[PDB]
RNA sequence: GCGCCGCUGGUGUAGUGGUAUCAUGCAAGAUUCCCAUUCUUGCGACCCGGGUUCGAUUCCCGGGCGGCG
RNA sequence: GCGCCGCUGGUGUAGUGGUAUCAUGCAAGAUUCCCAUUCUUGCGACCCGGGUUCGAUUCCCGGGCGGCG
């Protein structure tokens, strides 16, 4: 786990990721994600989407990566430059950049987003996408690259109605908070309950509180260990950072920054286009002339949690990376079964032909159930292929053995990657089992309780 | 349907997509996809992934969008330029471009891809991602833009073993083929069966045949009508194009081009790095000196189906776009229930408070079942809100009515967007129903057969 | 690209050297209890920059964007 | 960025002005019938360009990339 060299090796060898254009020499700070890396990235993203977007009914959008210079001048990003400069169309009349963040488009599409939500508040938009920084010296691999996938969430809330109705769901949750006070006081982080936290005013409100809870739950869900995960409040526009402890030290992997008055303002000035919600009045005010007002203009506070996926990924790598006891050439990852690149591996004992039927029958069966599987029927022994599949963090292994070919209820075995423990179950309900473990409704323990274990080949 | 102005209007108004940076004046050929557009895009992509990637067990990868000039010189793309030019890092020693296609990275990562598949053939890689063209005059909206999402598939096959074992699944399929012969002969396309097609040699092989079948099935699955969908063979490196008929005419939406000798070669020359598979020999040849050879080097043929998602999207728009009979202000889309941005809309009759419970209870219930839903509890009448939800192509509508508040088995109604037909079913199994219709296991007809219809409010 | 006009609430429009008509839409209220009901009330716009003018959204010049070869 | 070395099959390495050692890995065969078994056989490499040389992967110069401030 602590050994970054072994890990880096296992990552490179099995093509989790790799230096970009390595046949042309490679280019620093640019990385390509192979089959397993891509699969893990995708799984992580799907989980994120159905964690925040579905649960909060967030308006997600696709925006363009190119950006006209005036847009990035209004936001003060422009101000030898760390952005990627190009030109648009025919000639150099219209210079643009590659977006440094996927936040801007949301703001620039605010009016239509607000209309879509019927003009009502609060409302959340979000953008999952690639952003680009012309860093000078990228090191640490994924930690500092020049192009990367981030998932951003914009929460637009009435400055006067900033109080979240789903907060008692995250109320009893215990986190490591690293407040600015504790930082200037030469102290360390503290394990507080969330509600206690907001009461004592360490966390401004229950919206930031709720977000912090959910963000926690997500980051732990994908495989980050709580003990090495904290929330450091920014110190001298109130920002909180979800940070993880790695071999490189404490790195920022999520940025929760909540800034009221704005760039929404900025753009509204530069373009002279009001970007403002409106709230009807319970009691219409009359104000020269008699002039009753029935609505008030509202520029909404904005909470912005932005997730850096390269770093969430890497953190998962370091925390999950384990080495077996005995054969230390055998390494594996401990990916949670909901993000594992492959939930299942389909393996026969030896190259014996009578195994070919059941292998295919179930491989076509797992697909029908939508399970990501890797069927390994190559030359080497069962132990070797296990080492291979464990190495890429395959969650479970289905072994077809001689007792599969000679039994009335045809049974195969199911091996837990982590524990090296096995059970034996009929081949007809194996896809059901695997599928459900991959969708987190049950863990390995309950499978171990529901089915008879593997004691030996009869 | 034929009316592009009405459609364009409904697209703009409900924010399916919109001109990029419109508050800054907008920029031609760049478009941002709102909530519904993004949802449809995502659904389409998920369906694509579980259509090709899962079923063929394709090695999917994430590659970088930036690209060093030598890479694109080897591929002869460079040769006032239609690509987006920038520089990498500190200064202008290292100029690069924005990838015009997501194909290159796959080739550049070929060796590790081939190793991952144990060196065996055949094997498929694929890349879903954005590509960039500095077009001069973009028109037709999505048809010709400057940045767009394409999904590419690389199939690597032994030139001598080009014969697909899953072809009898697409054998009895009937398509419109537009062969080059028919084109130079002043004829039109022909509705051939696929197997007949390959026998008479109009389609070179059963791999191109199989791909063509699957591509067909996919494009029809997402909502493209067969009658306005054909496969035109390229005429004077054998290429086939999946084309659709729109108001703009026949446009190319998928490119199936199958070119043996290569850019794999090109890169292998420029970099001096052999990109070649190897095949063991059944009978080891002995060839001066006695020198037995046991493997032959094989440069594999490559089949490349590339999908243009902007165009597949637009095609879906034009084909699905319908206008009601009577109130022609009422327009709707006929999105297949597997790609519909929202499968369900949750609607009460009137603003009456006693409806608030059941609405929430099921909205939290649909989420638990993972169903994308839009709960509309706004001021206007049921007809207005229907018009709204139909307008964005919501697949089904759940109506909470007075008979929901006063019945022992609490029942609500389910309305079919297309037909305007309704049924009535208990609120406890509604998420099940909706969920399954959204996962294509049953159609509306079987629901209409399984449940009692809506005849009137008791 | 090059060309002939054009750009007014979210959408569709009338109008003029003295800051804007009507319809739809969206909210709130009341009606209404199945398919944009009705009434009331409220919300929102002259694509940018420069020039000419006492004053331009209107006239002229140049961005940008759109329709079409 | 600037700096001190460095780059040899997929990975880890020995070696030298005359084109490369060993281990692992991956295939095929045979053993083996639960956790990288064993034997046999096969597959694969000197990061690029220039210079000096009869000849460089080795020496020098400059790309690129990596480790580290
Ligand atoms: N050079 C970079 N490489 C990887 N991630 C980055 C980089 N810069 C910013 N991020 C991500 O940005 C998030 C914080 O937002 P910000 O620091 O404002 O960009 C973190 O989650 C990071 O993962
Ligand atoms: N300017 C463009 N806009 C949208 N799609 C494009 C464009 N150029 C190529 N494509 C897509 O590329 C595919 C065919 O490949 P190719 O024409 O070689 O790029 C089609 O499916 C198109 O959708």
Q: Which positions on strand C lie below 7 Å from a protein C-beta?
A: 1-2, 10-12, 24-37, 41-49, 63-69
Helices B35-48 and B309-320: crossing angle, nearest 10°?
Answer: 110
> Is A311 labeled as ligand-binding?
yes
Q: List chain B residues with CB under 8 Å of A54.
A: 367, 370, 372
Q: The tokens of A162 are what?
A: 């900033």
Structural contact between residues A429 and A369, judged by C-beta atoms closer than 8 angstroms: no
Token reading at A133: 């920084």
Buried b (16+ CB within 10 A) or exposed e, A405-427: eeeeebbbbbbbbbeeebbbbeb
Q: Give the integer Cα–Cα distance in Å for B384 and B382.
A: 6
Contact B337 CB / ligand 2 (< 6 Å):
no
| B205 min Cα distance to partner chain A (Å) | 24
Torsion sign over Cα A168, A170, A171, A172:
positive
* Both tokens assigned to A235: 């110190």
Gap from A79 CA to chain B (nearest CA, Å): 17
Q: How many CB pairs under 8 A join A and B?
A: 182
In 3D space, the residue among B36, B450, B13, B8 whose CA is nearest the CA of residue B246 turns out to be B8
B145: its two tokens: 């833009």
Separation of alpha carbons A140 and B180, rounded Å: 54
Give resolution in angstroms: 3.3
- Strand D nucleotides below 7 A of a protein CB? 1-2, 10-12, 24-37, 41-49, 63-69
The answer to whether A212 is a known ligand-binding residue is no
Evaluate whether A277 touches A119 at the Cβ level (below 8 Å).
yes
> How does DSSP assign A83-118, residue by residue?
S-EEE-SSSTTSEEEE-S-SSHHHHHTHHHHHHHTT
Q: How many CB atoms lie within 10 A of CB A47?
A: 17
Please state, in angstroms and rounded to a whole number, the distance separating the CA atoms of residues A230 and A112. Answer: 36
Spell out the domain ranges in chain A. Answer: 1-340, 341-458
Which residues in chain A are closer than 8 Å to B20, comparing Cβ atoms? 63-64, 105
d(CA B87, CA B110): 26
**Which residue in B has a C-alpha nearest to residue A74's C-alpha?**
B24
Residue nearest to ligand 2 atom 15, measured at CA: B255
**Inter-chain residue contact A15 with B267, CB threshold 8 Å:** no
Given an 8 Å threshold on Cβ–Cβ distance, is B116 in contact with A33?
no
Q: How far is it, in rounded angstroms, from Cα A132 to Cα A127?
A: 15
Q: Is A145 in the pocket of ligand 1 (CB under 6 A)?
A: yes
Closest by Cα among B311, B316, B437, B304 to B366: B437
A191 Cβ contact partners less than 8 Å away, ≥ 6 residues apart: A174, A175, A176, A177
CB atoms within 10 A of CB A327: 10
Query: Cβ atoms within 10 A of the Cβ of A365, count?
Result: 18
Contact between B149 and B101 under an 8 Å Cβ cutoff? The reply is: no
User: Ligand 1 pocket, A252 CB below 6 A?
Assistant: yes
Distance of CA A340 to the CA centre of its chain: 13
Q: Please enumerate in sequence order all residues whose Cβ is within 8 A of that of A33, keeping only pairs 6 or more positions apart, or say none.
A: A16, A17, A41, B61, B62, B63
Q: How many Cβ atoms sit within 10 Å of the Cβ of residue B22? A: 16
Q: How many CB atoms lie within 10 A of CB A243?
A: 23
SS3 A316: helix
Q: How many angstroms separate the CA atoms of B194 and B168, rounded?
A: 9
Quickly give B79 CA vs D66 C1' distance in Å.
33
Burial class (CB in 10 A: 0-12, 13-18, 19+), B49: middle
The reply to whether the CB atom of residue B135 sits less than 7 A from any atom in nucleic acid chain C is no
Would you say A90 is a known binding-site residue?
Answer: no
Residues 354-413 of B with CB under 7 A from strand D: none
Phi-psi region at A140: left, alpha or beta (left = phi > 0; alpha = psi -120 to 50): left
Provide CB contacts within 8 A for B25, sequence distance 6+: none
Phi, psi of A268 (to 5 degrees): -60, -25
Which phi and psi (to 5°) does residue A157 adopt?
-135, 140
Candidate from A129, A133, A145, A311 with most ligand 1 atoms within 8 A of CB, to mutate:
A311
Tell me the binding residues of B: 101, 133-135, 144-145, 152, 252-253, 304-306, 311
Q: Residue B287, class by beta-carbon neighbours within 10 Å (0-12 exposed, 13-18 middle, 19+ buried)?
A: exposed
Contacts of B380 (CB under 8 A, 6+ apart): none
User: Residue B380 corresponds to which tokens in the numbers above?
Assistant: 């206007």
CA dihedral B257, B260, B264, B265 (to 10 degrees): -140
Q: Are A235 and A184 in contact (CB under 8 A)?
A: yes
CB B208 within 8 A of CB B237: no
- Which residues, 6+ apart, have CB-to-CB distance to B55 below 8 Å? A367, B214
Q: In the structure, how far is the CA atom of residue A252 from the C1' atom of nucleotide C47, in angstroms?
A: 42
Cβ contacts of A411 within 8 Å, gap of 6 or more:
A403, A404, A424, A425, A426, A427
Q: Where are the alpha helices (DSSP H) in A154-229?
A: 180-184, 194-199, 206-221
Residues shown for chain A: 458
The residue among B209, B53, B165 whose CA lies nearest residue A360 is B165
The residue written with tokens 């996809």 in the block is B33
Within 8 A by CB and 6+ apart from B215, the residues are B242, B254, B256, B305
How far is Cα of residue A168 from the mean position of the Cα atoms in its chain?
A: 24
Q: Which residues in A lie closer than 8 A to residue B107 (C-beta atoms)?
A: none
> What span, in angstroms and rounded, lies between the C-alpha atoms of A41 and B57?
17
Decide if domain B1-340 falls under CATH 3.10.20.740.
no
* Chain B residues close to A80, C-beta within 8 Å: 90-91
Give me the CATH code for the A341-458 domain, please: 3.40.50.800
Q: Are A65 and B147 inside 8 Å of each other by CB?
A: yes
Distance CA A217, CA A236 (A): 28
Structure tokens at A371: 């399970």
The answer to whether the beta carbons of residues A411 and A403 sit under 8 Å apart is yes
The shortest C-alpha distance from A42 to chain B (Å) reads 10
CA distance B251 to B3: 18
Q: Are strands B123-132 and B59-60 parallel, antiparallel or unpaired?
A: parallel
Which residue, by CA, sits nearest to atom 7 of ligand 2?
B144
Comparing C-alpha atoms, which of B179, B222, B25, B82 is closest to residue A86? B82
3-class SS string, A264-298:
HHHHHHHCCCCCCEEEEEEEEEECCCCCEEEEEEE
Assess contact for B390 and B396: CB atoms under 8 A: no
Residue A89: left (phi > 0), alpha (psi -120 to 50), or beta? left
What is the sign of the dihedral through the CA atoms of A16, A21, A22 and A28?
negative
> How far apart are the C-alpha atoms of B290 and A365, rounded to whole Å?
50
**In whole angstroms, what is the distance from residue A341 CA to residue A335 CA?**
8
């Amino acid at each position: 786990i602590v050994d970054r060299a072994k890990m880096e090796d296992t990552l490179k060898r099995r093509f989790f990721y790799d230096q970009a254009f390595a046949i042309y020499g490679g280019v620093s700070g640019l990385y390509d994600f192979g089959p397993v890396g891509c699969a893990l990235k995708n799984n992580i993203i799907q989980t994120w989407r159905q964690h925040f977007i579905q649960e909060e009914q967030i308006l997600e959008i696709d925006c363009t990566m190119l950006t006209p210079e005036p847009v990035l001048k209004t936001s003060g990003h422009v101000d030898f430059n760390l952005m990627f400069k190009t030109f648009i169309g025919p000639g150099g009349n219209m210079p643009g950049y590659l977006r440094p963040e996927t936040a801007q488009g949301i703001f620039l599409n605010f009016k239509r987003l607000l209309e879509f939500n019927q003009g009502k508040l609060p409302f959340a938009a979000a953008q999952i996408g690639n952003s680009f920084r012309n860093e000078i010296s990228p090191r640490s691999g994924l930690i500092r690259v020049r192009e990367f996938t981030m998932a951003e969430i914009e929460h637009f809330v009435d400055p006067s109605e900033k109080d979240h109705p789903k907060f008692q769901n995250v109320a009893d949750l215990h986190l490591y908070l690293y407040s600015a006070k504790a930082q200037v006081s030469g102290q360390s982080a503290r394990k507080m309950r969330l509600g206690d936290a907001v009461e004592q005013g360490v966390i401004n409100n229950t919206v930031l509180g709720y977000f912090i809870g959910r963000i926690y739950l997500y980051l732990t869900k994908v495989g980050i260990s709580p003990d090495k995960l904290r929330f450091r409040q920014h110190m001298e526009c109130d920002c909180w950072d979800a940070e993880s402890k790695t071999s490189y030290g404490w790195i920022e992997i999520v940025g929760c920054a909540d800034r009221s008055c704005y760039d929404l303002s900025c753009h509204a000035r530069a373009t002279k286009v009001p970007l403002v919600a409106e709230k009807p009045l319970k009691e219409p005010k009359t104000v020269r002339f008699q002039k009753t007002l029935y609505v008030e203009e509202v520029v909404p506070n904005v909470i912005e949690p932005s997730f850096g996926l390269g770093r969430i990924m890497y953190t998962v790598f370091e925390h999950t990376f384990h080495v077996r006891e005995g054969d230390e050439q055998r390494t594996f990852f401990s990916f949670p079964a909901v993000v594992a690149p492959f939930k299942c591996s389909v393996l026969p004992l030896s190259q014996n032909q009578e195994f070919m039927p059941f292998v295919k029958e179930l491989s076509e069966a797992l697909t029908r159930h939508g399970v990501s599987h890797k069927v390994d029927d190559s030359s080497g022994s069962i132990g070797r292929r296990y080492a291979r599949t464990d190495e890429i963090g395959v969650a479970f292994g289905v072994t077809i053995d001689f007792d599969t070919v000679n039994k009335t209820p045809h049974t195969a075995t199911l091996r837990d990657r982590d524990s090296m423990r096995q059970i034996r179950a009929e081949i007809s309900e194996l896809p059901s089992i695997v599928q459900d473990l991959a969708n987190g409704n049950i863990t390995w323990a309950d499978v171990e309780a529901r089915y008879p274990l593997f004691e030996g080949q009869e």
